[PDB]
Nucleic acid binder design. Structure first.
Lengths: 169, 488, 65, 65, 257, 179, 263
RNA sequence: GAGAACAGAAAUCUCCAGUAGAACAAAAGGGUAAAAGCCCCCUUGAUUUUGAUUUUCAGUGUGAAUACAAACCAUGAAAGU
RNA sequence: GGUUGCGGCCAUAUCUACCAGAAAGCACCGUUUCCCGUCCGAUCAACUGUAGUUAAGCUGGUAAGAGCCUGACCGAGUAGUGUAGUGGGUGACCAUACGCGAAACUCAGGUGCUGCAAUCU
């Protein structure tokens, strides 16, 4: 028994990481804006890395956070790329999961010749109602053990909701 | 900022000694005290036991068999009420002072941004102090929810500035005289105009006055007297909206008009002459008062505050019936008129002759007294609500205080650094408030003849000040375009 | 011939001398209470706004214009 | 006049306190009745001398408000 | 699991900081620091908002704890004709008015420092942890306390209708918020927009048959009732303290040998 | 209700610290832990001392102001504040007086040569070329002109000379507190 | 960052010195009741206090250096030491530093009959408030140990010095009396520290001006058995009372005129 | 640690633990930790006026430096800083 | 005796895992027109108290749990250190008495008390 709780989706975050910082980043911000319907937020380089010539505070990646019915809709578009199968190691120990794809067109964009074949990462976070007790300012607390989302729980939620195509649990 | 000189070394050496110890009276000395009243005259031979102030009051309540307080000073030995040790036989003059106590006003609540241009006039409602109207140069008046300090209704309808406001002394109608040569009656509850404007004078309206409620027959509404620069004052029937009959004869403009409680109007003018009318004899100019030697700016009656609020008091308690309203107004008006022993009320007026005359036109036609001292023109005068005191707002920065019965000089209130425009009394006759050409309001302790609190906060000069009848709010307005409400 | 310029400074549009209201009552009351002893001499005068302090009293007003 | 604040030609003249064109002087504004927020009254304020008093007789200054 | 020294090496925060209830740096500023060495006691109007209620209570900070001098809660407002909407901005104003008039009454300023006589009551708004947003109901309680005659310092900025690009308040939007103008407008264009959404969201007003345009009336009469009688009435004791304890003790778990 | 309470030896006061020092005769047999009327005795005695203290204290000179509530850092018009004297009792300071700061060789130079210390006119000086007031130093000071002026590099030469004069100033000052 | 530059300035010497912060140090032998008195007395001092929360191996009459180090690192001058032993039960050693070297020890042991805050009732009161002192017993003016303890407690609890005082804040008195008068050679009566809250009732003897005041006991009923004492060196005492140093026939007349009397 | 096209041990995104294995200019006591760290918003200053310390030849009153104070000034809803 | 708001002491209060929670309260929770803020009504702000739920927070209880705490004459006035003497020895050093003066070990106990206000089968 469960008092109407379920593994509801908080938010999925769409990362576009780039080895560099040029006009490709503005292109990626444009494609993320067009896809998610929100203005993305660029990410500053954490620390310098000479492998790809990363320099601190330079903009590596754009990402957007999206919630609610829009999140459901865009994740539904995304698994169509996966055809409702995804390997098990995607599923976190904390219940979360995500996946990646090398393209934009298949999940619903026209080619738009300036927008070439550029990549994208999904990652979806899922926690039961009552997650606010971690985020709220006053009387911040921790979510209880019987409430915390686990790997198996997201497995079952994925099974009953979309399809049953986890590969190798 | 320049400072008080610091104490010297000997000053600090003496400030550490056991000092200024209150005399902690010993129980032995006892000297006689004789009782005579300042209000009208002398009343016996008594020897009280160096007693405290309160049981002088109980001694009077026992003497006349009432058990209203009293004051107990004289010779204004230290004129002070140990309460009768060396501070005051003892020649004990007394008088009835006031029933309640108004808390001095200290904090600008906030500024309200309703009016689009300079505020020119403001009156508090007589029944309550949650209501207030201010007329400004934006052609409009506004009703202020001055307990929530927020605008209620914008009162539009004048084609030019609004120059004078008055709340009907039964608390029923608001009138707004204007730079249009037209006055308008307003619904204080709805914000809608009471029909058409009162097309009247040929020049701008300068003043407004209503009938004291103790004179109106029960069941009818008070009339309204309006003056203007054309030198004529009209009297309107506020329900039939007709100029019931005009009233003319001033060669120059009319600065102010008051509707007394003896049926006699009074009308100051720039022709150096205030003339008394009689409303009963169809407004015939029954008398002329001519002693002033330049423009006569203002007028105040000994009963004027009561005339303004006759149907109410500081409690704001509503009148049960209009006949009861009239009865209450009548017992209010005689409370400050017969108190001298007869229904004899006085009138003071201030002119640019730099001076003030005291009049008692009901019996005389020549001044009671010479009130000089000011170095520039006197802009405003108002008696204390009990009629025992007079204060003059004068340009030359100053305010002076006079004995309200014989016009004798008492003191001066210095502290303003620009010309003082208006002065509003507290309803308990203990506190003033003044507005100046400088930005500041100030309140004054009449008992100690000294400033109580300076009240800055206006960006620019302040033209209006009013003290609500329950003594809990005041208001201001001026070139700053914004209404300040101040409270304890 | 010098280069006589005056810079745009905020200091020149600010107040330089203010007098408290309480200091005004203090000095206004102290002016009357002072007495001069013939053996006291003035070494140095306080810089005071006497225009706000030397307000005497008067029994007669100026005649009108 | 209360003080000479800045003669634009040179600080030697300011020390000498000469009044020429453009010198910033401090004046006793207690007559004007300026009151600052907070209730203090301004009685000293700067003014720039706008004429050449040597060839006019008088010192004409404009107030730095 | 955590290492034995890691629990030992750790120093524990204060009890009302473990549970996120006090910002005791702000509490330090509010209680311990003074602008003047003049040893004036300083009171502290604290306003708190629960999911259902509003707590306004002036608090003197004392050597052995905080002592409440007066207190007023939103759930008292049914006494004054506001039977619903107990958390909204107008309710915050009403509660501030109530606590203001209540402490003004019980302190002797309505209806031992011998040196002067009467003296206005200055308090300081303690908000605690909720953010200082313009529009916040905590400043509604501020406005209510100030308009009630509680002489708490504040500024124009955080009242609703104060504009950033302009420099002043807009008193019309404010007066809307004192009298529930925003809720009246919402319920108007909600019954105009979607009937089901209006009905599910305002079925208290529909049951009580309170109309949108009557919110002005109920808040005005509420203010007048508050100003006439702010004195606190302890509700009623259906059961004595012993009885409540006896009923409460029997759903307890008790310590064992 | 009595307030005028006396005792044979007078009480001295230190109103600066709000203290009253009593010097009358106390008996051991009234105070020791055998006596269960101990606390009442002490409370009464200190009540008497407080009563005289407050009697003197309220009878102090006291100042009252006319400033509004929304003033700056002072008392409001309504409240009348006792004006306390300096503390009569002498108490040990916390730290020695800060006089330990010495006198430098530039000052001896400026006292031998007829040097007058400069006036503090301000940071801004008139840049006659560009018609602006540019500060002498600091944020885009008029000494950081040659660093980006558009005419080995002479700019680095100025920067090195200037930086080593800064080093010299610090070098000279750090030998002055060895004096 | 120049936050530190402000801290060094706030620490370093000033003409009009700050309020003297107190440090409450628990020694190795800090039993629970001593921590209770420390909480209560430190509360009576706050906001000018710091409480250290670990055991400290400090013996203030054998190695005085650690106290000097703590008076340096914490700007606090006044200090307190929690100690107990079979020789000295419930002992508080009250330190005073001048500069940062030691100006005073004193050794006050708490008799077992003490009472805390929690043993009493409480009224309205405000923390961080200036207390008024009473010192009974003639020996405070004269006897060296009692002069030392009087200056100790004044300097400890006087808080911030002020010249204008709000009558509302006169809310509690600190009362300190010697156990009884004595002669030379009898052993040093222990001192009685009591804290009382003021209550003023009207009394129409002197009028409205001066009320009748009666007291209510709140808080630390303490009895202090005097022990070992460190007296400052006479050079340090004569140099620790230096006035900051900030005229004949010349008087600052009222209204600020320098006047010379000519004679 | 567990995860997410590139993608590795170090690129970015996510959750969980963090309890200072963060940066407090750092001696070094304390962990200040809803900050003293990071980001954002607003914004000056070598202001003004008087007294203790200095110098004459202009000490003109602090004229000028200087000590201190007070008026301000900045910010904040406010306590305050 | 629950519960809330503000606190004092700031681990007897912490973290780790289970169970229980009547009523009220808290809370999660429902909705974005308005004030308001975000990449995102997640946080923040507002609105309803209405559509729901005690699952979580929170509070209790349990634990051969990890820590943490208290008292003791528990070491013990000892170890240690400070002061006199034909006390001494090649020496490091140690007798004898007398002021300060420990900790580990040991025994036993514990695992939140408490101030002001409001409200509760």
């Amino acid at each position: 028994q469960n008092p109407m709780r379920d593994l509801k989706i908080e938010k999925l975050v769409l990362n576009i990481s780039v080895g560099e910082s040029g006009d490709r980043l503005t292109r990626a911000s444009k494609v993320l804006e067009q896809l998610s319907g929100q203005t993305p937020v660029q990410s500053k380089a954490r620390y310098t890395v000479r492998t790809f010539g990363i320099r601190r505070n330079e903009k590596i990646a754009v990402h957007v956070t999206v919630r609610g019915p829009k999140a459901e809709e865009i994740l539904e578009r995304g698994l169509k790329v996966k055809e409702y199968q995804l390997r098990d190691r995607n599923f976190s120990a904390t219940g979360n999961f995500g996946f990646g794809i090398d393209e934009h067109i298949d999940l619903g964009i026209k080619y738009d010749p300036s927008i070439g074949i550029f990549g994208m990462d999904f990652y979806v976070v899922m926690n039961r109602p009552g997650a606010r007790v971690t985020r709220r300012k006053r009387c911040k607390g921790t979510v209880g053990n019987s409430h915390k989302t686990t790997k198996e729980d997201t497995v079952s939620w994925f099974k009953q909701k979309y399809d049953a195509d986890v590969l190798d649990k | 900022s320049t400072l008080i000189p610091p104490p010297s070394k000997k000053q600090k050496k003496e400030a550490q000694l056991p000092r200024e110890v209150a005399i902690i009276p010993k129980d032995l000395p006892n000297v006689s005290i004789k009782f005579q009243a300042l209000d009208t005259g002398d009343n016996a031979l008594r020897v009280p036991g160096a007693i405290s102030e309160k049981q002088l009051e109980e001694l009077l309540n026992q003497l006349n068999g009432t058990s209203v307080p009293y004051t107990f000073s004289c010779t204004i030995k230290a004129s002070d009420p140990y309460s009768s040790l060396i501070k005051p036989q003892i020649t004990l003059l007394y008088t009835p002072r006031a029933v309640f106590k108004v808390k001095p006003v200290t904090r600008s609540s906030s500024a309200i941004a309703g009016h689009g241009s300079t505020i020119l006039c403001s009156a508090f409602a007589p029944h309550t102090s949650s209501r207030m109207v201010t007329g400004a140069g934006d052609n409009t008046a506004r009703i202020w929810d001055c307990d929530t300090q927020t605008p209620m209704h914008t009162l539009k309808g004048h084609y030019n500035w609004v120059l004078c406001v008055s709340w009907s002394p039964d608390g029923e109608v608001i009138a707004t005289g204007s730079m249009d040569n037209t006055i308008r009656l307003w619904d204080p509850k709805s914000g809608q105009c009471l029909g058409d404007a009162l097309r009247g004078h040929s020049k701008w309206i300068t003043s407004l006055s209503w009938e004291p409620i103790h004179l109106v027959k029960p069941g009818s509404k008070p009339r309204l007297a309006s003056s203007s620069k054309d030198g004529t004052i009209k009297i309107w029937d506020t329900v039939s909206r007709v100029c019931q009959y005009t009233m003319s004869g001033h060669t120059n403009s009319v600065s102010c008009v008051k509707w007394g409680g003896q049926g006699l109007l009074y009308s100051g003018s720039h022709d150096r002459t205030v003339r008394v009318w009689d409303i009963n004899s169809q407004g015939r100019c029954i008398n002329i008062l001519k002693s002033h030697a330049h423009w006569v700016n203002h007028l105040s009656l000994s009963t004027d505050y009561a005339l303004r609020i006759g149907a109410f008091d500081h409690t704001g308690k509503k009148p049960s019936t209009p006949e009861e309203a009239q009865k209450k107004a009548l017992e209010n008006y005689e409370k400050i008129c017969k108190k001298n022993g007869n229904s004899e009320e006085m009138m003071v007026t201030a002119s640019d002759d730099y001076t003030m005359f005291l009049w008692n036109p009901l019996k005389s036609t020549k001044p009671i007294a010479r009130m000089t001292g000011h170095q520039k023109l006197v802009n405003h005068v108002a008696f204390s609500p009990d009629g025992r005191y007079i204060v003059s707002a004068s340009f030359d920065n100053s305010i002076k205080l006079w004995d309200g019965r014989d016009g004798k000089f008492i003191s001066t209130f210095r502290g303003h650094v620009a010309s003082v425009y208006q002065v509003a009394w507290s309803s308990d006759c203990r506190l003033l408030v003044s507005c100046s050409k400088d930005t500041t309001l100030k309140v004054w302790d009449v008992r100690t003849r000294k400033l109580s609190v300076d009240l800055p906060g206006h960006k620019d000069e302040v033209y209006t000040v009013d003290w609500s009848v329950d003594g809990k709010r005041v208001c201001s307005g001026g070139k700053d375009k914004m209404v300040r409400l101040w409270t304890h | 011939i010098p280069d006589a310029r005056v810079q745009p400074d905020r200091r020149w549009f600010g107040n330089t001398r203010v007098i408290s209201q309480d200091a005004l009552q203090h000095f206004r009351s102290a002016l009357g209470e002072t007495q001069k002893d013939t053996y006291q001499v003035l070494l140095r005068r306080n810089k005071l706004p006497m225009s706000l302090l030397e307000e005497k009293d008067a029994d007669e007003s100026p005649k009108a214009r | 006049i209360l003080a000479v604040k800045k003669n634009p030609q040179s600080p030697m003249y300011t020390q000498l306190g000469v009044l020429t064109k453009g010198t910033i002087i401090e004046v006793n504004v207690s007559e004007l009745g300026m009151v600052t927020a907070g209730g203090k009254v301004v009685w000293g304020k700067y003014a720039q001398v706008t004429n050449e008093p040597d060839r006019d007789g008088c010192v004409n200054a404009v107030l730095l408000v | 699991a955590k290492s034995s020294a890691y629990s030992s090496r750790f120093q524990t925060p204060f009890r009302r900081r473990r549970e996120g209830k006090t910002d005791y740096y702000q509490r330090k500023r509010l209680v311990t620091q003074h602008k003047a060495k003049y040893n004036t006691p300083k009171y502290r109007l604290v306003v708190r908002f629960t999911n259902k209620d509003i707590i306004c209570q002036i608090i003197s900070s004392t050597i052995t704890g905080d002592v409440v001098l007066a207190a007023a809660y939103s759930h008292e407002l049914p006494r004054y004709g506001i039977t619903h909407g107990l958390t909204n901005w107008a309710a915050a104003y009403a509660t501030g008015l109530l606590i203001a008039r209540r402490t003004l009454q019980k302190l002797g300023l309505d209806e031992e420092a011998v040196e002067d006589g009467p003296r206005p009551f200055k308090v300081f708004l303690d908000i605690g942890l909720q953010r200082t947003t313009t529009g916040a109901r905590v400043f509604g309680a501020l406005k209510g306390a100030s308009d009630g005659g509680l002489y708490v310092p504040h500024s124009e900025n955080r009242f609703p209708g104060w504009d950033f690009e302009t420099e002043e308040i807009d008193p019309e939007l404010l007066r809307s918020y004192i009298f529930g103008g925003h809720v009246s407008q919402y319920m108007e264009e909600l019954a105009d927009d979607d009937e089901e959404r209006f009905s599910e969201l305002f079925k208290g007003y529909l049951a009580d048959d309170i109309d949108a345009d009557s919110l002005e009336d109920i808040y005005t009469s509420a203010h007048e009732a508050i100003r006439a009688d702010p004195a606190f009435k302890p509700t009623e004791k259906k059961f004595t303290k012993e009885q409540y304890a006896a009923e409460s003790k029997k759903y307890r778990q008790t310590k064992l040998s | 209700l009595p307030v005028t309470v006396e005792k044979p030896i007078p009480v001295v006061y230190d109103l600066g610290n709000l203290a009253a020092f009593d010097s009358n005769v106390l008996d051991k047999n009234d105070l020791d832990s055998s006596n269960a009327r101990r606390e009442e005795k002490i409370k009464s005695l200190t009540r008497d001392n407080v009563q005289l203290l407050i009697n003197q204290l309220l009878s102090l000179p006291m100042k009252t102001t006319t400033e509004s509530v929304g003033g700056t850092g002072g008392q409001s018009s309504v409240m009348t504040l006792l004006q306390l004297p300096d503390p009569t009792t002498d108490l040990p300071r916390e730290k020695p007086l800060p006089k330990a700061k010495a006198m430098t060789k530039w000052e001896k130079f400026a006292a031998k040569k007829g040097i007058k210390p400069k006036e503090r006119a301000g940071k801004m000086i008139y840049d006659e070329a560009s018609g602006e007031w540019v500060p002498k130093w600091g944020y885009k000071g008029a000494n950081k002109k040659l660093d980006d002026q558009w005419l080995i590099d002479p700019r680095t030469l100025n920067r090195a000379e200037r930086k080593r004069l800064v080093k010299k100033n610090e070098k000279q000052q750090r030998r002055n507190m060895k004096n | 960052n120049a936050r530190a530059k402000r801290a060094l300035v706030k620490r370093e010497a000033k003409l009009v010195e700050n309020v003297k912060q107190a440090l409450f140090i628990p020694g190795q032998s800090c039993n629970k009741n001593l921590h209770d008195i420390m909480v209560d007395l430190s509360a009576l001092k706050k906001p000018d206090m710091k409480r250290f929360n670990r055991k400290n191996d400090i013996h203030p009459f054998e190695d005085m250096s650690p106290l000097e180090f703590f008076s340096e690192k914490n700007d606090c001058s006044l200090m307190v030491l929690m100690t107990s032993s079979k020789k000295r039960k419930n002992n508080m050693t009250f330190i005073r530093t001048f500069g940062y070297k030691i100006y005073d020890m004193i050794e006050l042991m708490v008799a077992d009959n003490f009472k805390l805050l929690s043993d009493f009732k409480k009224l309205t009161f405000t923390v961080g408030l200036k207390p008024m002192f009473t010192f009974q017993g003639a020996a405070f003016d004269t006897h060296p140990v009692y002069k030392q303890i009087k200056s100790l407690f004044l300097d400890f609890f006087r808080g911030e010095s002020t010249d204008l005082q709000d009558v509302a804040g006169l809310q509690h008195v600190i009362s300190m009396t010697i156990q009884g008068d004595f002669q030379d050679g009898e052993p040093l009566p222990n001192v009685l520290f009591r804290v009382y809250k003021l209550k003023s009732y009207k009394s129409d003897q002197g009028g409205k001006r001066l009320p009748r005041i009666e007291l209510v006991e709140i808080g630390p009923r303490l009895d202090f058995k005097i022990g070992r004492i460190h007296t400052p060196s006479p050079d340090m005492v004569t140099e620790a009372h230096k006035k900051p140093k900030q005229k004949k026939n010349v008087e600052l007349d009222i209204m600020g005129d320098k006047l010379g009397r000519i004679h």
